[PDB]
C-alpha cells in the first residue's frame, strides 16, 4: 500500500504548497518588500524604513522546490 | 443514526481549502498596500456568491 499513500501524498503536498504559494504572492504583492543576503549584521534596520522582512518566506519556496 | 453524521465528514477537507482561495481573493481588495482610508464600507462577497449561483440558477431554468 506504501506506493499507493506516497502517490496520494506526493500530489496532496504539491496542493497544500500551491495552495501556501498562492496565499505567499498575494502576501508579497500587497506589500513593500526588502532584500538582504547572509552579510547582514547582528541586527539592523535596513536603507527604507517600515519595510517588512520576507526572505526566508522565498529561501524556503527553494529549499521545497 | 451514526453513519448519517459519519457520512458527512469528508466534506470538511475540501471545504477549508475553498476558504484558502477566498482569503487570497479578499487580500488584494483590502488596498493595505497605500495608507487604508478609515471607516470607509466596501465589499466583495456579494459578487462572489453572485458568480457561484448565476450558472447554476441559469441553467435551472434552462431545465424548467
Ligand atoms: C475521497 C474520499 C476519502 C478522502 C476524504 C475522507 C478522509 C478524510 C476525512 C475523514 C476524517 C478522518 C480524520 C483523520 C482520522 C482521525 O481523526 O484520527 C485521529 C488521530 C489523532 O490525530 P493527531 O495525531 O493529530 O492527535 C491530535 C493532536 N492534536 O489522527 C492521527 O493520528 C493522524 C492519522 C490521520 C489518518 C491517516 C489516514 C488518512 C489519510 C488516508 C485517507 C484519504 C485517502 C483514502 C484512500 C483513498
Ligand atoms: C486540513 C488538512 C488537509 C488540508 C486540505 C486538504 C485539501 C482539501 C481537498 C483538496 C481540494 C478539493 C479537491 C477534493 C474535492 C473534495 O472532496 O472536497
Ligand atoms: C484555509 C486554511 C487556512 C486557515 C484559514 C481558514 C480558517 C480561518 C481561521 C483563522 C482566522 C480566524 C481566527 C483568527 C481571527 C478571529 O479570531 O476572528
Ligand atoms: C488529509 C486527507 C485529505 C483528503 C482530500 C484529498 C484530496
Redesign the interface.
Known sequence: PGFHLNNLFIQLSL?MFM?TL??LS??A????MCIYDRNKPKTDVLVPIGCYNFQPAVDWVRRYT | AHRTNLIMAEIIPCAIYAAGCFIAFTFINAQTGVKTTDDDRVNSVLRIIICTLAPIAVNLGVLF
Open positions: 496542493q495552495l498562492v496565499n498575494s502576501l504583492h500587497e506589500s513593500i
